[PDB]
Amino acid sequence: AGAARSLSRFRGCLAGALLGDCVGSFYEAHVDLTSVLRHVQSLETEALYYTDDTAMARALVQSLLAKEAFDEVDMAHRFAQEYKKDPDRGYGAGVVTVFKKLLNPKCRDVFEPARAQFNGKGSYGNGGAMRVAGISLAYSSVQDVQKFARLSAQLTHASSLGYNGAILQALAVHLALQGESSSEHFLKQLLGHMEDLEGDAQSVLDARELGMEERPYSSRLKKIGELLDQASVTREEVVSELGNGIAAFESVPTAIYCFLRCMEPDPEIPSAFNSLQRTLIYSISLGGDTDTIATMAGAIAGAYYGMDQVPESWQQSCEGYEETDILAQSLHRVFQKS
Ligand SMILES: Nc1ncnc2c1ncn2[C@@H]1O[C@H](COP(=O)(O)OP(=O)(O)OC[C@H]2O[C@H](O)[C@H](O)[C@@H]2O)[C@@H](O)[C@H]1O
Ligand SMILES: [Mg+2]
Ligand SMILES: [Mg+2]
After folding, report:
1. Phi and psi of 247, rounded to 5°?
2. How far does residue 291's CA lie from ligand 2's centre (Å)?
3. One GO molecular-function annotation for this sequence?
4. Which of 1, 76, 86, 302 could bridge 306 with an S-S bond, Cβ 3.0-4.6 Å?
């Protein structure tokens, strides 16, 4: 609410992400709309633990705040120390190898452990994107959002399939912080940026080496546009065309679709729930990697709808919600310079 990049949008963004992670984590790797509507009834303190999505998002934001800038060695070290402090947050199986290499003080090029992952091709998991929302709070221009979404993602995700998913998620939060938009304008801006990135020769090769379609994020954003004009869209159709998995390309477009779809009321979700709430409910109903898809749709929706749509009863159920709010306020003061 309010002006572009307002305090309310900053707070709402990080709280929306935290709600998505904590509430989504109950359905992790499973889901039906009726049973989700039953499960959110228990939300009406800090009993819901957060996962790696929030742990890494907190480390990313604390690094930006400590250096008032992107610092790859500070951020890599905060990622690795956060893992060491609490390894049981539900990290991806591969990225733990990156953390353990970063914890070796002999490692003096912090981008190289990510590049060795998966036979030297790098991870395409959604972990670079799940934590990226703070980049869009710290940087206002598209150029800087792309640049540091990429760099922060590359600390663990060296494949363009992974870091371009982080950029797409950061760009979606960047646009949501600007306020009112049609769904079709929002989508068209994202598609334009991804078509530009996916023209790059390294992206084309990464996609071809995996057997994927030309311009994979651009293709899925086009599928979102078709789905948004389609009659009687079912959850099975959404999952079939966009995915609900741990790969960045099977979850980041899915999160954006959930945001865009839920800009309008849904007769199947009770009207007592506000727009942020129905986005999270809809996201979780897709199943699959629910904590990460919901954390990403929640970061976008929180930035768009602001803190007045963050319900106190939901927020106060989440582990660390006060520290999340303080970090959002600090980003607004330090980087937006209020
Ligand atoms: N290039 C690849 N080739 C084959 N498998 C891959 C590749 N990249 C990723 N995977 C598979 O993808 C897995 C995860 O990639 P990881 O880089 O460990 O970590 P994340 O941070 O992205 O975690 C991704 C999500 O998974 C959990 O739900 C987390 O909470 C995240 O939400 C690998 O173990 C591989 O099996
Ligand atoms: Mg998680
Ligand atoms: Mg996950």
Report:
1. -70, 145
2. 5
3. O-acetyl-ADP-ribose deacetylase activity
4. 1
